[PDB]
């Protein structure tokens, strides 16, 4: 029906129908009489996956023949979402499958809704890994994603009485048609034990063994016939494990628990042994796999054939593990091993919040990984010798830069380990990378300035435009062709349409259709009703104090109080939508969810308000939900305290899909405003420098409370029980935090935020001018393609050239 | 190459090759460059399983249309072995697949060796269930096998220093191509909780829920296009289970442990809570499935449409569970519910050893299954009221017959429950069924004589002749056609060939070839060497004192001592093979294994013995090993103390495959001798009556030691450390048991056994007469087909007619 979804040729449609019926019969063992809708989904998934096979085999044999430098992207998170539509998109099969299923009497969109998200990540860091895999395949790089196959991904969030409840995400229950188990590449991973010193080197002995079994998932490039691999490890007990008899068999669970569940903390470090085991498990298995592949091509050439990218410090044990293998097993001298390690590894930092940095207690590494601790001590000694020689007599520099932190419990600073052992260190947006050089890692930058880079984040325009917003993709393609899908900078061509009345109409129409579709989704699957003519004001992202969902809450209550004060004045109607999961042990984030729903309970049932203001909490925010809500949004809320959000990627998704942004000058927001023009962005609030100034003289929230009467009213409503009549003191913790211990200065940005929101309402009253500003945002979103990001990693870090050329079909 | 393996037509061979290549590519994602031998096995398994699909769908739709009475065979064990060859045999595909793989450059037999046994049983009881499924499908009955899908089956046995070591049988590691998960028929099973009484009935509340997920495995009939289902339940935690967060997810293992591992006790009861949970789990899920299927056809008609066969007392909770559903959920009155239950259920007993009978402590049922305990008390009260009315004043009868056993701990006698709640009770061989009426269940037989039946055990001639011994099957088919494969009584026709010189030669030749093949197997995969001209003397079965592997050991040492006494006399050379697993907690059985290997260590390295006597312990005896060794055997050792082996089925396998039998008049041995003629069987030892007489006056082993000098020598060799020079007292427990507490009267049968063994050696010196006696055994083995057994269950218990007619192809 629409052009960018590909051809529906008669031979292809006929073949798809035939293969669908074959899988339903021979694979699922069903006929049309008994087949459940889930069966039809699986028949389609098997039909589509068949098309990946030849390309997957020939891609991997091509890398074997050509032997290019291989890129290994190590991450504890890969937030993939659904795979069916994405695979159709990248193979140009969407229209053909739509037609084939139509002719079989089935609605493809309904079948798509049956697929479980692969929710193997928490938020931005996990989703970045996923966008990256897509871009690496689209750019023809010999790339492999390596991670853990968690049996349970991020929990499903249910809201009960306004409170978050967690349930297990049993995503493999029905089986995963997108993975192939590879038991023949099963590898042993070692834990505990002790170090023995002999005449010729150290030996790690008396270890416990866990097996690492790999599962391969295809990663198709966009219409280039490239299919790369994401290899995820699953933990298996050896067969002689604990081998009264019954108990020994049941105890296999202890070993297999390593790959059981994703830790649900976003930007927070928890020093739990099971998490450390997960980190080593992925690193040990991956490195053996890498080395095995390299030998099937002398370690001088290792860095010419291997790049390892560490996604934050979670896989930081790769550094001492590589040293361990090179020194203990291969018998290289320390200095040569070290040279190889440094040239091989690169590190990407994703946060500056101190509570998020990994600092592992020494006693934990001592017991679990005794040889790695010894290697880390040796790395530290040699590194600090270099610091002492460069900055003679600077004894405080020595303690600041040490990988070993002194105190009550001695800890290892994993970020310091990553910097010492990597040839490149990057932040994820220009302002974040600057903050790294100026504050957090200032000492390291002074020692080795050449190591520090920026690589501004991006998103894939395949999932985040073509897949989720075909209507917008189509009206764009009608004017500029479809080359922009893998060359997003071409969207600049749309600037010459900003005065085109047909395009203005079409852009506004597509947004309207998306909003109608989302309004319908809400009624059908949540029995909740909304006005589709209102401004859709959306903040979706994990719940964190730094992200300031609370600031948004204050604005919502402000609008409610103004309406109640002057009921008969006109206000631009809004649907305010907030969604996101809270980490299970994060009390304040759970209280914020409760506040949001409690505000909704008052606002949504006030007769005087009518349909002028609605507050909805979007339950179970995840990749599939984002694909629905982002295309429907008018206003994107990106309101973190300046200096706290390293980049953001949600911001970029909204920009690409025709929402305007209200935001602080934080993370990639700065670069977004710079690309679009500050006139085309709703910027408010303290800059980083303003935050610094306030910290110096001291942040007194009371001052704001005292001079802003509208703010005072809200605090008094919260305190007195206006939003919780049966438990009047319910929100006391929130009020006390705001008044006395707010690290994120919510009150300080309140006035500017409200005034900026008034300017948004003003522009939305003028549909034509709203839409022209939207066009200027979409047209300048090109920089934020992860294809650009990956091309920069490739050229400036990995030392490889991207290729847009297609492999034989 | 051989006729009974079917046709290798040009179209079929071409199609198989094509589909093999398709699965290797599209299913396994491999090409011929990287494909492992395991990959080739899977490609073949998928190619063969494709042929089951249409037949499986049409069989099940046929049962839906015709609505015949359904047979539900409930067992905690299904000892299936490998599935690939069996499926080819039953579909007539063996020659075609042999040819197709040959043309692809592959050896099919080598691919067959890659398949894991489905080892979901311990021994005879589990293997009986498997033979039964085959016969039910071959006889066109609407039958379903229901059990548990254990993640770990019977342990793999390794012998280390002559001692048994157990390792986990991780049989699902590579995935099982013969099962289809059916998540849409997932059912809840309830545990713990409490009983609440209301105005209208009892209610079972506050329960913990475990989910039962079914996996279906096809059971093909022999060339009749019937494909029945074996449905095995797997335990799954609900998603809100235990729902700090991490621990709650890891604790799901506690619920899922129910289906983790098969209890490895053969003929021994262990009152462990996990075992009780397994028994209820299979019963609760199965009964809901049965009832659901019945409603998709008023409970008066229930027994006309449903038969439930209880394989021993392990699924005895079906009786109170059916009552529970009928009374509590469907609101039938007690007496009507009871009538339905009794007419529906039948019970098969498999043992008379008191330590094997299930007697569950009341306190365990009280906590785990409070409502079932109440129902059991009520059943008992009403039953004992009937006993009191039939035998007024007989107060000891009342205590003897009670389902509740008094004592230190009150227990429930599950066998008494089964008798009370079933319309039929059967033993598994004529002598065993007689023993049930005369001793163990005498009181019950006097109350309800009509309930008691015999159904002599059988084995399937598909697996146990055609599959494992194609050479023998072929020379038979050459003379009498191939109808005997599903009508085994036709083997009587072979009696007119007992004087045929060509047939005599062919029978002897096939045995020789089988022995050469097995001698080669032993060298290749165990580096052990044997003389293929020797008499192959085989005892394979689980290790138990009652089975008297120890009596066999005494004979072996006797032969060794005689050789050493007169080294230069001629003796018929023997290879004595003993194999079987010991239950992990059964100390004496583990000591017997150690004795066997210790005897081998002395005998096999004595230069004076040469190749005249060899003693081999066959490691890891299981269904696949039985298929190899049974066709190779000359002498079958079936030497249990009279009255202890209920039937035996191993005995029948050897008879069908051309071994002669040395045995006591125990279990089915009696009926075997009766069929073949006592002159054609090597019978020795006490009859049941002789055992009874000895028990009355008291068994004194010392008497035998005192008057048999050859026996005295052996005991002195054992005691003094002749067979364990470094640990002279190693076998003290064995000697003390033999001398002072032998329940199985090993010494009492010693003299007769040795003399009978001399007669065996004498006949083996005359090849022509040995073979004529073999022909007389094979020719009269027809009675022992499980087709006969199942036809009797069908007509005399289930009330259904078997059909040899084929369904549309
Ligand atoms: O269907 C569920 C099972 O599927 C198996 N996949 C098999 S057999 N082939 N996959 C082929 C494949 C896989 C991915 C992409 C393309 C193809 Cl063409 C996985 O190994 C199991 O771990 C999983 O449980
Ligand atoms: O670069 C991608 C995105 O990365 C995010 N970081 C995240 S989700 N870290 N999770 C860290 C984490 C995850 C799990 C466990 C412990 C921790 Cl400590 C940043 O906050 C975003 O500003 C940025 O856009
Ligand atoms: O390959 C391993 C996986 O296979 C799956 N089987 C599928 S998809 N089809 N089976 C079809 C089938 C099954 C049996 C007989 C004939 C056919 Cl035609 C099982 O449901 C999984 O539990 C198992 O792990
Ligand atoms: O009828 C088939 C065969 O049944 C065997 N019984 C067996 S394996 N019981 N296992 C009982 C068992 C099994 C598991 C756990 C506890 C127990 Cl208590 C008989 O000993 C044979 O003489 C007979 O041929």
Swiss-Prot record, chains A, B:
Give the GO terms filed under biological process for this record. glycogen catabolic process
Enzyme Commission code: 2.4.1.1
Indicate where the modification Phosphoserine is found in the sequence.
3, 402, 486, 719-720
Activity control note: Allosterically regulated through the non-covalent binding of metabolites, being activated by AMP and inhibited by ATP, ADP, and glucose-6-phosphate. The activity is also controlled by post-translational modifications including phosphorylation.
What class does this enzyme belong to in the EC scheme? transferase
Please write the reaction equations for the catalytic activity of this protein: [(1->4)-alpha-D-glucosyl](n) + phosphate = [(1->4)-alpha-D-glucosyl](n-1) + alpha-D-glucose 1-phosphate
Q: Where does AMP bind?
A: 31, 64, 292-297
* Entry's family note: Belongs to the glycogen phosphorylase family.
State the protein's name: Glycogen phosphorylase, muscle form
UniProt source species: Oryctolagus cuniculus (Rabbit)
């Amino acid at each position: 029906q629409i052009s960018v979804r590909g051809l529906a040729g008669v031979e292809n449609v006929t073949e798809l129908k035939k293969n669908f019926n074959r899988h339903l019969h021979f694979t699922l063992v069903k006929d049309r009489n008994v087949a459940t809708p889930r069966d039809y989904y699986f028949a389609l998934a098997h039909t589509v996956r068949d098309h990946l096979v030849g390309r997957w085999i020939r891609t991997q044999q091509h890398y074997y023949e050509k032997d290019p430098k291989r890129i290994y992207y190590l991450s504890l998170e890969f937030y993939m979402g659904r795979t069916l539509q994405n695979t159709m998109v990248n193979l140009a099969l969407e229209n053909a499958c739509d037609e084939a299923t139509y002719q079989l009497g089935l609605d493809m969109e309904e079948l798509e809704e049956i697929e479980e998200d692969a929710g193997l990540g928490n938020g931005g860091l996990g989703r970045l890994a996923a966008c990256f895999l897509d871009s690496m395949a689209t750019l023809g790089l010999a790339a492999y994603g390596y991670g853990i196959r968690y049996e349970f991904g991020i929990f499903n969030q249910k809201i009960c009485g306004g409170w978050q409840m967690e349930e297990a995400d049993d995503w493999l229950r029905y089986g995963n048609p997108w993975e192939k188990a590879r038991p023949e590449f099963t590898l042993p991973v070692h834990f505990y034990g002790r170090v023995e010193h002999t005449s010729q080197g150290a030996k790690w002995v008396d270890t416990q063994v866990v097996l690492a079994m790999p599962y391969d998932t295809p990663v198709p490039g966009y219409r280039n016939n490239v299919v790369n691999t994401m290899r995820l490890w699953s933990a298996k007990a050896p067969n002689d494990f604990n081998l009264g008899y019954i108990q020994a068999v049941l105890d296999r669970n202890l070993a297999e628990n390593i790959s059981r569940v994703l830790y649900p903390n976003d930007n927070f470090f928890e020093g739990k042994e099971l998490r450390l085991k997960q980190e080593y498990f992925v690193v040990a298995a991956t490195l053996q796999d890498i080395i095995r592949r390299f030998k099937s091509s002398n370690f001088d050439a290792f860095p010419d054939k291997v790049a390892i990218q560490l996604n934050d410090t979670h896989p930081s044990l790769a550094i001492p593990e590589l040293m361990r293998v090179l020194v203990d097993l291969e018998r290289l001298d320390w200095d040569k091993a070290w040279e190889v390690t440094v040239k091989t590894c690169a590190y990407t930092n994703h946060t500056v919040l101190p509570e998020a940095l990994e600092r592992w207690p020494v006693h934990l590494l001592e017991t679990l990984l005794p040889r790695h601790l010894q290697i880390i001590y040796e790395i530290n000694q040699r590194f600090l010798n270099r610091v002492a020689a460069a900055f003679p007599g600077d004894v405080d520099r020595l303690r600041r830069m040490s990988l070993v932190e002194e105190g009550a419990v001695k800890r290892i600073n994993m970020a310091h380990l990553c910097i010492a052992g990597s040839h490149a260190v990057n932040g994820v947006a220009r302002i974040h990378s600057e903050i790294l050089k100026k504050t957090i890692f200032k000492d390291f930058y002074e020692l080795e300035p050449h190591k520090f880079q920026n690589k501004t984040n991006g998103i894939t325009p395949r999932r985040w435009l073509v897949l989720c917003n075909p209507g917008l993709a189509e009206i764009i393609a009608e004017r500029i062709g479809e080359e922009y899908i893998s060359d997003l900078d071409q969207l600049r061509k749309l600037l010459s349409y900003v005065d085109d009345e047909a395009f203005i109409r079409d852009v506004a129409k597509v947004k309207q259709e998306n909003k109608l579709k989302f309004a319908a989704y809400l009624e059908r699957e949540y029995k909740v009703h909304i006005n589709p003519n209102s401004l859709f004001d959306v903040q979706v992202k994990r719940i964190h104090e730094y992200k300031r969902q609370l600031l948004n809450c204050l604005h919502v209550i402000t609008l409610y109080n103004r309406i109640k004060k002057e009921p008969n004045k006109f206000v631009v109607p809004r649907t305010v939508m907030i969604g996101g999961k809270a980490a299970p042990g994060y009390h304040m984030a759970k209280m914020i969810i409760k506040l949001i729903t409690a505000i909704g309970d008052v606002v949504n049932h006030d007769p005087v308000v009518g349909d002028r203001l609605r507050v909805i909490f979007l339950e179970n925010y995840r990749v599939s939900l984002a694909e629905k809500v982002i295309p429907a949004a008018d206003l994107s809320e990106q309101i973190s305290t300046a200096g706290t959000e390293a980049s953001g990627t949600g911001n970029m998704k909204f920009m690409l899909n025709g929402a305007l942004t209200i935001g602080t000058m934080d993370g990639a927001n700065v670069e977004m405003a710079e690309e679009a023009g500050e006139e085309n962005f709703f910027i408010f609030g303290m800059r980083v420098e303003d935050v610094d100034r306030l910290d110096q003289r001291g942040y007194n929230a009371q001052e704001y409370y005292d001079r802003i009467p509208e703010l005072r009213q809200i605090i008094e409503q919260l305190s007195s029980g206006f939003f919780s009549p049966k438990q009047p003191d319910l929100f006391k913790d929130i009020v006390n935090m705001l008044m006395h211990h707010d690290r994120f200065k919510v009150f300080a940005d309140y006035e500017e935020y409200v005034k900026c929101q008034e300017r948004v309402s003003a522009l939305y009253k003028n549909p034509r001018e709203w839409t022209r500003m939207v066009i200027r945002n979409i047209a300048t979103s090109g920089k934020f393609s992860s294809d650009r990001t990956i091309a920069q990693y490739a050229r400036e870090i990995w030392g490889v050239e991207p290729s847009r050329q297609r492999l034989p079909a």
